[PDB]
Amino acid sequence: NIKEDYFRVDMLLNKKGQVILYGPPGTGKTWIARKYVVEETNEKTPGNKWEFITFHQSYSYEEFIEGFRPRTDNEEKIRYVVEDGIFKKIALRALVKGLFELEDATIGKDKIHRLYILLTKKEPLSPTEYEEYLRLKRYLWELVGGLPKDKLKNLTPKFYLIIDEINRGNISKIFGELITLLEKDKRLGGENQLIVRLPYSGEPFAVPPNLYIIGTMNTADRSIALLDVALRRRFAFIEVEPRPEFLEKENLKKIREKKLKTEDRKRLNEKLNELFSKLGNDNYFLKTLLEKINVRITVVKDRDHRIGHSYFLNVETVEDLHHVWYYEVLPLLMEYFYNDWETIKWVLNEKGKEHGNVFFEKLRLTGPNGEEAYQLKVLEGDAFIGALKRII
């Protein structure tokens, strides 16, 4: 079921240019973003073919594209150079690797490979050869400004920039005058080829058409669809919904044995069968538990306030299902409905019951105005599975 989402991402990548994997948390929309880039680019490490970037409110324009930094120059001669960020370094690296395998750009191809080594250099650049990095970049954009739009419609090395939590950072502060470049119509190779200068260093800049921005985005904090007006038109949105198909016994055995496929995977099978023998006789218990609680969430609050399938994905026994339920999702369900006991009971569909193996026992006290509030109860053993069985 993972190749069906790779075909959906790859369809909306070559059509739009960049993608937002928006979904409720507990979905693998960072892992889908991380594994699709690793599968397509064939680079397991985040370096020289792709880069991982996390946004936040403290993230600024000076460290994302370029800003000013002091260096380790001479002692009484501390200098402020324009050290490039990550997005300028990844778009230059996609442009340098794109022109390295081009046929009509053979005027200085022995120098473009020199510029490629400087961009995959995994350290701060030395000041005796930073001007060699400056002169090779000035040689490059002179060459791309004197090339037609015929040979720049596509570049075969497809670079990526996995931006995680893209709605956390203020996207207008870090994309100053450069949010228009992300569209396919305004990239370096569209008909509206726009080589904008940068406000520092006087250097021109334009993103190549192979650099793809795969963003991951939570949409359960407050965002639904209208929070991101500066990126809602440039970015193609994909609903990565919580699939509870990954909680079947056949699927849970296959997922955990994908990485740990050594001899201890047999020890998982005698452990996983011990879990699905204590949940009755069925293999569809964790799937029906997630489905019959996600339906009861999307009927009350919202669709994207849904419980993901990453909480229950790491259970091996009834004790680990006890730890997931009482410490990660029911303290998450109580903060969805803060002090509203008529519907947090109904999400677990025990609305008739007031006690007797219920997660929320009713206090015997009433209210002056008529308020009645319940109380959390810790269960353990076969009583807890008897309280989980009544949800499905």
Sequence ranges of the binding site for Mg(2+): 30, 164-165
Single out the segment in contact with ligand GSP by CB under 6 A; choices: 28-36, 85-93, 331-339, 364-372. Answer: 28-36
192 near ligand GSP, rule: CB under 6 A: yes
64 near a second copy, rule: CB under 8 A: yes
Q: How many helices (H) and strands (E) does the chain have?
A: 14, 11
**Token pair in block for residue 378:** 């810790």
Looking from the CA of 184 toward its CB, the CA atoms found within 13 Å total 14
164 near Mg ion, rule: CB under 5 A: yes
Q: Give the x-and-dash track for 115-154 against Mg ion (CB under 5 A).
A: ----------------------------------------
54 near ligand GSP, rule: CB under 6 A: no
Residues between 278 and 297 with contacts to a second copy, criterion CB under 8 A: 295-296
137 and 145 Cβ atoms separated by less than 8 Å: no
CA dist 29 and 35 (Å) reads 10
CB neighbours of residue 105 within 10 Å: 18
* Strands of the chain, DSSP E: 18-23, 50-54, 66-70, 80-84, 160-164, 196-197, 204-205, 213-218, 236-239, 360-362, 374-376
15 near a second copy, rule: CB under 8 A: yes
Region class of 48: left (phi > 0), else alpha (psi between -120 and 50), else beta: left
Handedness of CA 9, 11, 14, 20 (dihedral sign): negative
53 and 163 Cβ atoms separated by less than 8 Å: yes
142 near a second copy, rule: CB under 8 A: yes
181 and 190 Cβ atoms separated by less than 8 Å: no
Residues between 96 and 115 with contacts to a second copy, criterion CB under 8 A: none
- Binding residue (CB under 6 A) for ligand GSP from 75, 123, 191, 335: 191
CB of 69 to ligand GSP, least distance (A): 29
The values of phi and psi at residue 143, to 5°, are -75, -35
Q: Which is nearer to a second copy, 280 or 317 (CB)?
A: 317
CA dist 34 and 371 (Å) reads 48
Q: Which amino acid is at 284?
A: Y
242 near a second copy, rule: CB under 8 A: no
| H-type alpha helices, 262-358 | 265-278, 285-298, 318-324, 330-333, 341-347
Single out the segment in contact with ligand GSP by CB under 6 A; choices: 29-37, 64-72, 200-208, 270-278. Answer: 29-37
How, if at all, do strands 66-70 and 80-84 pair? antiparallel
- Binding residue (CB under 8 A) for a second copy from 18, 30, 210, 283: 30
CA dist 53 and 201 (Å) reads 23
Q: Of 182, 212, 190, give the one whose Cα is nearest residue 9.
A: 212
79 near a second copy, rule: CB under 8 A: yes
Binding residues for GDP: 26-31, 185, 309
313 near ligand GSP, rule: CB under 6 A: yes
| H-type alpha helices, the chain | 3-14, 29-41, 61-64, 87-100, 109-119, 130-144, 171-174, 249-259, 265-278, 285-298, 318-324, 330-333, 341-347, 382-389
Size of the site for a second copy (CB under 8 A): 144
Residues between 42 and 61 with contacts to a second copy, criterion CB under 8 A: 44-47, 51-54, 56-61
Size of the site for Mg ion (CB under 5 A): 4
Residues between 69 and 98 with contacts to ligand GSP, criterion CB under 6 A: none
284 binds, among Mg ion, ligand GSP, a second copy, none (CB under 5 to 8 A by kind): none
Q: Which is nearer to ligand GSP, 89 or 306 (CB)?
A: 306
- Binding residue (CB under 8 A) for a second copy from 2, 107, 117, 225: 225
156 binds, among a second copy, Mg ion, ligand GSP, none (CB under 5 to 8 A by kind): none
216 near ligand GSP, rule: CB under 6 A: yes
- Binding residue (CB under 6 A) for ligand GSP from 170, 310, 349, 357: 310
Binding site for ligand GSP (CB under 6 A): 2, 25, 27-31, 180, 183, 185, 191-192, 216, 218, 230, 233, 246, 255, 258, 310, 313
Binding site for Mg ion (CB under 5 A): 30, 164, 180, 216
